[PDB]
Design a protein around this ligand. Sequence first.
Ligand code: HEM
Ligand code: HEM
Ligand code: HEM
Ligand code: HEM
Lengths: 141, 141, 146, 146
Amino acid sequence: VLSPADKTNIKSTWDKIGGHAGDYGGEALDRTFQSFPTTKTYFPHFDLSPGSAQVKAHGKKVADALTTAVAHLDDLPGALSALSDLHAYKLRVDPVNFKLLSHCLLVTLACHHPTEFTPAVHASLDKFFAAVSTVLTSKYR
Amino acid sequence: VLSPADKTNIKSTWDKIGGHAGDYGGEALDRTFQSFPTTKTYFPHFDLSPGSAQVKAHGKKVADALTTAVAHLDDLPGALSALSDLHAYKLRVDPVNFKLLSHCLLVTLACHHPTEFTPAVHASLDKFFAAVSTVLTSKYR
Amino acid sequence: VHLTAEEKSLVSGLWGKVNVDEVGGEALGRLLIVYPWTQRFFDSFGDLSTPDAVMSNAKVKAHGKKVLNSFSDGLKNLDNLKGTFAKLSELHCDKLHVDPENFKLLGNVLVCVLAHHFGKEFTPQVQAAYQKVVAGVANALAHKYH
Amino acid sequence: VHLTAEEKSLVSGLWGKVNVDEVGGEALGRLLIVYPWTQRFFDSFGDLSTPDAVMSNAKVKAHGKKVLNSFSDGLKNLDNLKGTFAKLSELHCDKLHVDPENFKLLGNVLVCVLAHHFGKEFTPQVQAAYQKVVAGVANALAHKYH
Ligand code: HEM
Ligand code: HEM
Ligand code: HEM
Ligand code: HEM
């Protein structure tokens, strides 16, 4: 639902990551693919090697999607309804995989911004990614 | 979600349930206890015996809640606010046990209503129980 | 995976009059309907776009019967679920890459269908035993991830 | 499990610099803050009502250390996780009835603390190894539920 403070936390930490955000998409995808190899199956078409330019780009597309979210916290379903139709109807992802990448979204954050990744913030970011996951699985409901 | 298709199926189904609703809540609860012994643990104060009147009586109150829910599908959040508080703040029920009781509520209805329990109605009911449950856990978020 | 000597008999009691032809495709058909992301794995099965389409699709039924057999094989060998589903774990985990969450789910819609089929004969006593079987099958099929 | 020579050396590499007295408590404390419903099981721990309060709780802190050591114990026994964590299964499964899902949750928020302390040198490579270690500790714990 996101208390006002949850949004305060999300808006600040996203400020502090800044121009870095696109690159964290690529790292967080990376960690998902290495940590849970079941996930790579969704990207047959992708070169998945180490320095992959392809994942790089996509991770950036993903962070972009998240930067939009942080600017539209009071209305995600509306702001993120395209990616729902895409992810539910066309990709038919498995809702479990949002649980997984979202963990790898946190793990990247902690790796880079230890000063801002305080438990209260860890809690508000977990809440943020879960909200983004619910919107994108919404068409299953 | 809760597309007028599903709303029609829930409403339509709760209707042929009739007076047997409270009775089911009891059988549903019964069913959760036997299948998932992990769950009886929220009721140390209940006799969980074979005829238990507490178990019988609690089920009526659960079955009443679900009928309030059917009566207000475009606003479950406000309708169930007192239970959101209760199941989150006081009982601290695990989000995982709504999934468990929800399955058993679905089994209950199958057992008793073989005609109405079509695939499409079976999905609509699943949406409805997941929705109710989403709202009861809604206070960890 | 325990299942008391009474529960084991509570299980074949029931499974003796299961309809091998119709139950398996029915549970598999409802799975696809209730958890639509699961059609990702059935790209070769033809048309699944509406509940009626899924229910009558003849492969869902045929494949459905084969999947029932695995459960039949599991009921016959309950003290060695691993071995029985060893190679079947490899197929889903190593080749199909199905998340083992979904093994839980199929089992649960299988319980539902049995409830639906046996009605009041599916007692809470009986259901609770079948939950044990389905957990062990769902889980023994998920070993190649352990 | 799985855990290739490479991985094993990385996983040992990190432990050697983890802060024994602090990391475990930091992970229980965040699991407490982040999934408030886990607090059901700590009715003798005193005050938990605020994050800053949870993260000063002496007992939370001192009990976190206990949890690490059973990980240390698991990390020296990747081969017999089922045995090493056998008796703690009973406690968590027969006695407390912690739903097994929260084993997988605590493991994961440990991976966050490793991550928080190490930054750079917690490579995705390292993390993969440690998910393998977390995941096995969780099954070890959920075994009596199996
Ligand atoms: C918060 C989580 C997620 C966000 C914000 C997100 C966002 C996106 C975006 C922005 C795109 C590309 C948009 C476009 O190119 O038109 C995309 C595509 C895609 N997503 Fe996700 N996604 C998420 C989760 C997932 C998950 C969990 C999976 C499964 C592992 C997944 C699988 C895919 C695939 C296979 C594509 C197509 C890639 C391509 O062809 O370029 N996504 N997603
Ligand atoms: C559809 C899902 C559920 C509904 C509609 C529901 C509804 C209710 C209602 C109406 C009450 C009684 C409040 C009152 O007496 O005024 C209640 C109490 C309670 N609920 Fe639930 N609940 C649900 C799920 C659960 C689950 C999953 C658990 C945990 C396994 C749970 C545990 C309890 C307990 C321990 C009580 C107090 C029993 C008593 O002493 O009266 N509930 N719930
Ligand atoms: C948990 C109980 C399950 C059992 C007992 C089971 C059983 C089987 C068996 C025996 C086969 C081999 C049939 C053959 O190739 O001759 C099979 C194939 C297959 N299964 Fe499963 N399965 C289970 C769960 C699942 C789940 C949850 C999914 C995905 C949502 C799945 C997807 C598939 C797919 C895609 C095939 C390939 C068959 C084909 O394409 O013709 N299975 N399953
Ligand atoms: C990573 C998985 C876990 C491991 C390795 C683990 C390990 C342990 C150990 C070693 C002890 C007893 C240590 C001692 O005092 O001698 C313990 C106790 C306990 N654990 Fe776990 N645990 C895990 C998960 C959990 C979870 C998820 C919960 C709750 C959600 C939990 C709740 C408890 C409780 C209530 C006790 C008893 C503490 C007391 O003495 O009051 N554990 N656990």
